[PDB]
Amino acid sequence: ELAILKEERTTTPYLTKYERARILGTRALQISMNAPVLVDIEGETDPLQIAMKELSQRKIPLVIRRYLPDGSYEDWGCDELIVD
Amino acid sequence: SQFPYSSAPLRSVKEVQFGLLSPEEIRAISVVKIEYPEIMDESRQRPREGGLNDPKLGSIDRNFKCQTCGEGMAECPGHFGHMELAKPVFHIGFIPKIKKVCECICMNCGKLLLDETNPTMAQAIRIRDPKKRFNAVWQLCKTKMVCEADAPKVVSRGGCGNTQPVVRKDGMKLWGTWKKSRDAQPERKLLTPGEILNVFKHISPEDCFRLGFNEDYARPEWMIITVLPVPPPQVRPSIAMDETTQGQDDLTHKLSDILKANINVQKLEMDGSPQHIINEVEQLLQFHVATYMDNDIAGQPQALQKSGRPVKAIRARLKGKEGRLRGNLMGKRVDFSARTVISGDPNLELDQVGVPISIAKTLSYPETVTQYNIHRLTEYVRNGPNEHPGAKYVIRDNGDRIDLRYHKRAGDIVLQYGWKVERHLMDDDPVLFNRQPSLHKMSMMAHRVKVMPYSTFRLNLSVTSPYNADFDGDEMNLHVPQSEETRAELSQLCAVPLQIVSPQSNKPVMGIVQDTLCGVR
Amino acid sequence: VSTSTVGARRRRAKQQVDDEENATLLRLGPEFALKQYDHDGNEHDLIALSLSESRLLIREALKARSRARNGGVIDDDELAKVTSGAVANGVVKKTLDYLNTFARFKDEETCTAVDQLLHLHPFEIAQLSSLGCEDVDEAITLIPSLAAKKEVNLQRILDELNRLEDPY
Amino acid sequence: GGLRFGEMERDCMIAHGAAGFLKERLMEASDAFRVHVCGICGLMSVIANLKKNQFECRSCKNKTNIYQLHIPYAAKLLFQELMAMNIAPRLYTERSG
Amino acid sequence: GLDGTQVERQTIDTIPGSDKAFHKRYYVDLMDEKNSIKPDVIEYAADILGDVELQKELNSEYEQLVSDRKFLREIVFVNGDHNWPLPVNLRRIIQNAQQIFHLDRAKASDLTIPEIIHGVRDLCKKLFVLRGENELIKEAQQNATSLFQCLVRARLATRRILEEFRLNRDAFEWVLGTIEAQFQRSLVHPGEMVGVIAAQSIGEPATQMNVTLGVPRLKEILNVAKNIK
Amino acid sequence: QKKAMSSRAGVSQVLNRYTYSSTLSHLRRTNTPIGRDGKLAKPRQLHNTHW
Amino acid sequence: EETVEILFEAGAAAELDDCRGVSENVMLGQLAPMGTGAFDVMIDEKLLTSLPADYAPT
Amino acid sequence: MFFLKDLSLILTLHPSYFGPQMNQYLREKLLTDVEGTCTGQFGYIVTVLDGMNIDVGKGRIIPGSGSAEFEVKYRAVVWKPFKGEVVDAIVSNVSPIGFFADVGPLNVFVSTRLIPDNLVYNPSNSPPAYMSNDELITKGSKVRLKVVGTRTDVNEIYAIGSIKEDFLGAI
Amino acid sequence: IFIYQNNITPSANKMIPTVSPAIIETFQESDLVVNITHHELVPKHIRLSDGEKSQLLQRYKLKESQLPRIQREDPVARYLGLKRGQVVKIIRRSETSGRYASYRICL
RNA sequence: UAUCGAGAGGU
DNA sequence: CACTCTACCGATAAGCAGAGCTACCTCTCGAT
DNA sequence: GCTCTGCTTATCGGTAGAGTG
Numbered sequence A: 001e002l003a004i005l006k007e008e009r010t011t012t013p014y015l016t017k018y019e020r021a022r023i024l025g026t027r028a029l030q031i032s033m034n035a036p037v038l039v040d041i042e043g044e045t046d047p048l049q050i051a052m053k054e055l056s057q058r059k060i061p062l063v064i065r066r067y068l069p070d071g072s073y074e075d076w077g078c079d080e081l082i083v084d
Numbered sequence B: 001s002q003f004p005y006s007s008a009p010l011r012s013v014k015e016v017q018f019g020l021l022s023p024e025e026i027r028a029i030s031v032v033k034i035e036y037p038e039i040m041d042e043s044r045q046r047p048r049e050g051g052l053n054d055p056k057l058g059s060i061d062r063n064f065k066c067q068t069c070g071e072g073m074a075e076c077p078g079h080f081g082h083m084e085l086a087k088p089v090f091h092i093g094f095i096p097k098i099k100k101v102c103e104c105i106c107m108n109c110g111k112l113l114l115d116e117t118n119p120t121m122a123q124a125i126r127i128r129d130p131k132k133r134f135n136a137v138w139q140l141c142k143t144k145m146v147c148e149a150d151a152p153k154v155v156s157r158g159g160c161g162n163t164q165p166v167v168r169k170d171g172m173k174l175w176g177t178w179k180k181s182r183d184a185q186p187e188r189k190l191l192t193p194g195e196i197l198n199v200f201k202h203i204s205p206e207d208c209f210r211l212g213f214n215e216d217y218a219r220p221e222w223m224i225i226t227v228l229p230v231p232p233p234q235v236r237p238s239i240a241m242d243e244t245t246q247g248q249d250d251l252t253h254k255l256s257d258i259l260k261a262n263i264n265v266q267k268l269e270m271d272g273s274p275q276h277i278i279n280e281v282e283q284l285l286q287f288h289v290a291t292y293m294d295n296d297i298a299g300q301p302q303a304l305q306k307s308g309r310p311v312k313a314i315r316a317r318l319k320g321k322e323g324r325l326r327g328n329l330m331g332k333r334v335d336f337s338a339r340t341v342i343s344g345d346p347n348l349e350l351d352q353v354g355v356p357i358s359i360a361k362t363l364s365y366p367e368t369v370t371q372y373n374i375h376r377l378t379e380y381v382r383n384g385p386n387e388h389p390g391a392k393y394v395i396r397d398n399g400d401r402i403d404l405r406y407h408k409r410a411g412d413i414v415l416q417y418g419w420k421v422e423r424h425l426m427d428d429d430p431v432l433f434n435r436q437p438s439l440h441k442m443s444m445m446a447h448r449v450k451v452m453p454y455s456t457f458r459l460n461l462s463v464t465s466p467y468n469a470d471f472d473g474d475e476m477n478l479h480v481p482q483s484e485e486t487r488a489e490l491s492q493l494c495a496v497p498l499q500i501v502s503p504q505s506n507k508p509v510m511g512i513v514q515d516t517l518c519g520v521r
Numbered sequence C: 001v002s003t004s005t006v007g008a009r010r011r012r013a014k015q016q017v018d019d020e021e022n023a024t025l026l027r028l029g030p031e032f033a034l035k036q037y038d039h040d041g042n043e044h045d046l047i048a049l050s051l052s053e054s055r056l057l058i059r060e061a062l063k064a065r066s067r068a069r070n071g072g073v074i075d076d077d078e079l080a081k082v083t084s085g086a087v088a089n090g091v092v093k094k095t096l097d098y099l100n101t102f103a104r105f106k107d108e109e110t111c112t113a114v115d116q117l118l119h120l121h122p123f124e125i126a127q128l129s130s131l132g133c134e135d136v137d138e139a140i141t142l143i144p145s146l147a148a149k150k151e152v153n154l155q156r157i158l159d160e161l162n163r164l165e166d167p168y
Numbered sequence D: 001g002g003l004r005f006g007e008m009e010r011d012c013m014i015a016h017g018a019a020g021f022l023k024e025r026l027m028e029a030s031d032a033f034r035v036h037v038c039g040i041c042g043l044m045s046v047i048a049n050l051k052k053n054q055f056e057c058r059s060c061k062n063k064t065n066i067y068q069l070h071i072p073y074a075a076k077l078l079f080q081e082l083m084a085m086n087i088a089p090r091l092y093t094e095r096s097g
Numbered sequence E: 001g002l003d004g005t006q007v008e009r010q011t012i013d014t015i016p017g018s019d020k021a022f023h024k025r026y027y028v029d030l031m032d033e034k035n036s037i038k039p040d041v042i043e044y045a046a047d048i049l050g051d052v053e054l055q056k057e058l059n060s061e062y063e064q065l066v067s068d069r070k071f072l073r074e075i076v077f078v079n080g081d082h083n084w085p086l087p088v089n090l091r092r093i094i095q096n097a098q099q100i101f102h103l104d105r106a107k108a109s110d111l112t113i114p115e116i117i118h119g120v121r122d123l124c125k126k127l128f129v130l131r132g133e134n135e136l137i138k139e140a141q142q143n144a145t146s147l148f149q150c151l152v153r154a155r156l157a158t159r160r161i162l163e164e165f166r167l168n169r170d171a172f173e174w175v176l177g178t179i180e181a182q183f184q185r186s187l188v189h190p191g192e193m194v195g196v197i198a199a200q201s202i203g204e205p206a207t208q209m210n211v212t213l214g215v216p217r218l219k220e221i222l223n224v225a226k227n228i229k
Numbered sequence F: 001q002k003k004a005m006s007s008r009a010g011v012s013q014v015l016n017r018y019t020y021s022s023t024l025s026h027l028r029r030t031n032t033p034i035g036r037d038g039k040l041a042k043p044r045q046l047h048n049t050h051w
Numbered sequence G: 001e002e003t004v005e006i007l008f009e010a011g012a013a014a015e016l017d018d019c020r021g022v023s024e025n026v027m028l029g030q031l032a033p034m035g036t037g038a039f040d041v042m043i044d045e046k047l048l049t050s051l052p053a054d055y056a057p058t
Numbered sequence H: 001m002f003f004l005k006d007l008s009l010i011l012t013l014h015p016s017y018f019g020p021q022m023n024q025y026l027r028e029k030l031l032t033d034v035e036g037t038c039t040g041q042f043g044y045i046v047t048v049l050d051g052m053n054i055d056v057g058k059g060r061i062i063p064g065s066g067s068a069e070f071e072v073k074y075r076a077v078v079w080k081p082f083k084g085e086v087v088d089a090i091v092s093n094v095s096p097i098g099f100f101a102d103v104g105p106l107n108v109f110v111s112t113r114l115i116p117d118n119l120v121y122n123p124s125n126s127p128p129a130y131m132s133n134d135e136l137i138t139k140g141s142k143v144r145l146k147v148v149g150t151r152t153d154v155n156e157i158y159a160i161g162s163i164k165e166d167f168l169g170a171i
Numbered sequence I: 001i002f003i004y005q006n007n008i009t010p011s012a013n014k015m016i017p018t019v020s021p022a023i024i025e026t027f028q029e030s031d032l033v034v035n036i037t038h039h040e041l042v043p044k045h046i047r048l049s050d051g052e053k054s055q056l057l058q059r060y061k062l063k064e065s066q067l068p069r070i071q072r073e074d075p076v077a078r079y080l081g082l083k084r085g086q087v088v089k090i091i092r093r094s095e096t097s098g099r100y101a102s103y104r105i106c107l
Numbered sequence J: 001u002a003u004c005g006a007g008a009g010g011u
Numbered sequence K: 001c002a003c004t005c006t007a008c009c010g011a012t013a014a015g016c017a018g019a020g021c022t023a024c025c026t027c028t029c030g031a032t
Numbered sequence L: 001g002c003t004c005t006g007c008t009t010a011t012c013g014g015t016a017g018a019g020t021g
Ligand SMILES: Nc1ncnc2c1ncn2[C@@H]1O[C@H](COP(=O)(O)CP(=O)(O)OP(=O)(O)O)[C@@H](O)[C@H]1O
Pocket: B436, B437, B468, B470, B472, J011, K022, K023
């Protein structure tokens, strides 16, 4: 009902600075609780570092639910949002 | 995690429905009736049942669990009582609104003095907002000085024909003057709270709506007080001046005054009542119930403590810079904070802050134990709270903290994955740094810690400008984020380098200054 | 823990004592009103199930779940083992044996025949099918709600129901 | 004592868009409190024994529709102070329009 | 739709100058040989003169620049101010392309004229502030970027690209790609608390500062005073 | 004491002894009891007659 | 400003407060609908399915 | 009395469960948690319909905890008894204080004061039963009773019956 | 449209809403000596059709109460005879974008 | 490890 | 058909009372 | 102790209409 179909999405295809900070922090927390990591972990083992590696490879398994003023929303995966 | 488990689902608040507490509801939520003004049993220790500190109201003592909910003082929210009033009194906040409703309805049967047959009045009922509707209605009915029995054959609207009073406010009293039929003699009688209460209960549900009130939540007779909700001791705690000397809160004394004054209204109407005394004793109950809620009533003396200072009523608890909202809710004092004198350092990066060792050993960050940091964190635990880099607490998955000051076998602690170690503040931890007055967002920026000797916070000279800082005694404040999520907000949104250009004037707010600027020329 | 579609019921000034559940007076409480709502907000009549209906749904659902777990490849004691946990094995086994020994219309052919015969409150429709009866006198006693509805055929209903009822 | 994170520091965090940090400062780092409310009447009138696992709003005769909230202690205080003045501030966990 | 940190003062070059100086900088005449593009700056110089179909493009370019000049001079900036904060610093993008691609010389460009006019015209359709095909969205999007398009067209005109900046095909495609990327980066981000930022940006200077001025005048405005001094 | 409000505060003060100069100044101080509510400026200015 | 008068009027007129403002959520100790709070974060079940099968919950 | 009820369950998932079989885990978890349990509000949840196709939705990450909250909506067959409701049953035990009768999920107690007077408990008989002349209530006897009281433990519900009325008794 | 010279008595002013669905509008003859819509600072207001308004509300997913407002007594609203619920579109100079379309709905 | 005030100060 | 004579709603001020008055930080001292 | 605004009371006509010669 409230959900907006993928083909009719009008919001920005770039990850916002606010979405990035929340995604990195949220994913960091989940990693420190031993969530399955989707990238190889080499020498950089801090939760934030692993989360930043997953971000750079479009591998953070989270979805942004962007609410519009009327209450409807577009779900965007972090795999599909453009990272600078 | 510091909260003991509860099976009730955790949710956030999405809506606040305001309204008035009906007399029935006040009694339905109460856990004890408050009757006796003597706080103590008989100065023989323990609180008097039915008294203002009845233990059913809740526990504020470290060794007594609440006799209503069984929880310790930490969990117990406090529970309300109720106090029946011998005579109905006005709510001090609502007198001017009561006056408006009186001028709207017939003071005999309780009918809206105008009907939907009146075109302008029919327009006023159309207004969706309750507050605006009430005003549009009151602007019409104020001048209608007779309850019409007939619609404007004879079609009757249910009126009773009585003339309406001209209502005037005189302090906590409402006076109504009826004009007996040209000019003759008018007789102003007092509109007691009880009289108005009964008239208000006869307002129809349909007329309740047209007046902007609400049949379930804001019924107009609930503006008259017949039963008072007695707040628990959490709202009005006692304090001990010298260990063995304890005084009561201003609210506790004021409720005692209401209870005493209530008993004397019961003592008159049943025996020695010289009338001019019944009016003086009832007026005094109105006084205590009014100044208990609002002690800045214009035009009359303030209620005073025996010390001479005015009583701290509930209204004064909430208003002003120091009140409940601006002083406790929009801002408040916080843990994991620090403050000291600032100094400049030519040998620090722009985004660093030099933090005295003593501060870095007092502040802490709770790092979750994983396979990748368990060895590192055990080393901190062995060093303990007084040696840097060290640690202050070990937090179990259950929430139990292990205090590393008092653990003599700290070397025999084994950390489990998922535990937390509250380690000392350490190099490159992000922290929020701040100089007052906080005029714009770069008055609060995230810096990377560098732990350093001596007792000042160190700043790169080029961050002095956005902080408007210098080193003539200025002090600055540091705040430590406590989670992976709040660390990331600091490093990814608030960090100094992200702030070099400000949206204020699409230009930098930091540059080369002082020695470096003189020298570079 | 587990909750349903019916929500709200915020506090009102006036209480109510038309609430005590009495199956004789058709007072089934706040959860089993005549008009229910599904998980999309659409209005829907209450789904009351006779013993015979319920036997079909429960048995179908249990063997359909077993087939789905087998990628797409009979007895009640075996059919109840599809559930997860000894508490569920218990309630389901006790429910099937009860339905196995009191469901008159033990196949969907007869069941749809009873469905069309009956299609009047949804609670009564399930009672008439579950409780075998001889005469109208026994039906208006055990189901005192059929009193003031004034539209029988009841007897040929019971006669057809009893005729449709297979031997045992 | 702790430093005062005042209204102007609040405004700075709003400008930063640091919602998580501001929430944390004003809850976990200060007066975070858990209360139980009644799902029907919205008041903090619930009697909750946690070792007995029993909850009840006696006014509504309700033992099942009950929620816990995390709010500032000073918010619990504010709401109890409003109740003491006959104002009902009902905290609901669902909208209605 | 822009973030305050992302704009810089830039000159919109179709605004100043006389009509003669304007025409001298922007007009290309493929008929009059001495008013055409210099032959030593392009390789295809021979196949240029006389081409009426290529002159139709250069006319549509110059007519657009005249519209811009008329729009900017009669509606937006009547007093002639042509230096204004705008996103994406074009001077830096060009001088980086001149350095990255070694656009020194005295070397003829391999960049054809239709590539310039269509490249730039297609660029101004990819500067998405608002997305969606709705008629109102497309209108809002065109209004939102009108001024910036004028800035771009005033710089990336055929004559200037070839005579003045001396871009080749590799550099010109890079400038287009960079402009598109930097414009996206200059959009304000949803979630931005522009209210408090507005409040602090106006309030902070006031704390450090015959008609009434300064704080007493600010107070007259904000309070909507009925009797000003 | 019973009239602590409406009475003027700060008429008597603890004698400053931080250093000798501060004691001398404290014994020679004067106070204008106007307030802090109602800003104005006129009584705060250095008037010519202060010479 | 006018803190107590606002709240008295709100009771007497049964005002419904939808808690969408920044100040509401700050005083309720809730993540405010601003910046990092202007959206929700969901778990991407589709992207998790690219993990090997031995990562599966038991 | 059987119904189809539209229910839902809030499931919170720890991040270590954020793996490739997450949705299937939640569907199994719903069944393990809901099937066979009893509540006074809905009754016994007997079986869940279409368990392998339940739509678990998307998990909302809880701010500050990392864990995800799913609302698993489903439809089940539920059984709740009612005061006044007549039902059939199978007696499980007979004792001097009456008999116990299995009505599906739960067990109903009928006391001696709610048994007609001519039905007399006979321990010497084999097997023991409440007997009359043309009546016989031993273990395994189909009986038709009326639920006259429902008591709720939120774990198992307790119902007391009666055959002290018309058309009720052995069948 | 009734142009008066000095005043309209409040009693006669009540004869104005008693005459629907016909609409009476009053103007003081003084107030019309200069046409205010010719001023530099007053951009061109254009009333939206009933269809155009609906198109606007859907594009922004707006309730009517969420548009910026113009008072019924606004000089330009009176000039256009705007009634409650009607929307004007206003195309306006902008120093950041050149052109900007503002919408207001009449109270 | 009190509360209510007052006074003097720091940037 | 020319007069007043009073019941209306404007539009007046008109007087009034209260509401508000930067941020954070230090220390001493007296009364309850 | 000082500025502001809004809200609650008197004065001002102003008509606008029956009673009038
Ligand atoms: N009473 C006060 N209220 C609020 N902020 C104050 C204040 N007194 C000082 N400040 C803060 O401290 C700053 C004053 O700095 P000072 O050291 O007092 C003067 P300056 O203008 O920096 O240097 P100068 O001594 O070279 O003239 C103010 O700009 C403000 O940041």
